[PDB]
Each structure stands twice: as C-alpha cells, then as structure tokens.
Amino acid sequence: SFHVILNKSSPEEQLGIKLVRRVDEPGVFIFNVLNGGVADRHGQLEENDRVLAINGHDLRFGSPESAAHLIQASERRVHLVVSRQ
C-alpha cells in the first residue's frame, strides 16, 4: 500500500473521486476521478485503486458510504492509504 494526502480548500469541497463497492470482492474502489478536481490535480490516484483507510479509519472491509462520511468529516486533510493491482 501507499499514502496519498489530499487537502480540501473548504470543508464541504469534494475530492472528485467516485467510490464504489464491487459485487464479488471486498473493498472500496475508485470508479473514476473527476477532471479538474482535487484528486485529479494531485495526480496520483487512478481508476480501480482501492482505498484501504481514510484518516486512520480502516476501510478494508468498509463501504463507500463510510468513506464519504470520513472525507466530509475532516476539515481539510484527507490521508488515504491506497493499494493498486
């Protein structure tokens, strides 16, 4: 796994990542990265990356709903632990 730090300019700003579940395996995955958004401009995240944790909260067997809630909860800093096949 590897670390990605994204910073929100405002607490309500979205990261520009659509997170999804999969029918046949556990995990929270990136479906797409929105052009010009925070994640896109940072440049590291790719489609199909798995989000393993956000700000120290484990998402290995978590949901995109929990991920969204955690992203929103942070005032600015979003520390993602990510894996890529």
Side-chain angles (χ1 to χ4, degrees):
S1 65
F2 56 95
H3 298 281
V4 174
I5 306 299
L6 302 180
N7 294 303
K8 300 188 292 177
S9 293
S10 298
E12 69 266 54
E13 188 181 27
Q14 306 178 272
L15 298 178
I17 308 164
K18 174 72 190 314
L19 295 176
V20 298
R21 62 192 118 240
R22 291 187 178 164
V23 66
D24 60 351
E25 67 178 310
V28 177
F29 298 86
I30 297 185
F31 176 81
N32 64 14
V33 177
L34 286 66
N35 287 359
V38 173
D40 181 39
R41 285 182 281 104
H42 176 278
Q44 187 169 6
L45 295 172
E46 296 181 16
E47 289 199 6
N48 314 328
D49 285 351
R50 185 176 179 172
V51 176
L52 291 171
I54 293 177
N55 290 334
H57 296 261
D58 170 44
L59 289 167
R60 185 177 303 271
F61 295 92
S63 65
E65 293 86 357
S66 175
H69 181 73
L70 292 164
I71 291 163
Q72 288 276 23
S74 191
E75 292 303 310
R76 177 171 181 263
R77 178 176 173 95
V78 185
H79 171 211
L80 303 97
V81 177
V82 184
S83 66
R84 177 175 298 166
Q85 295 312 301

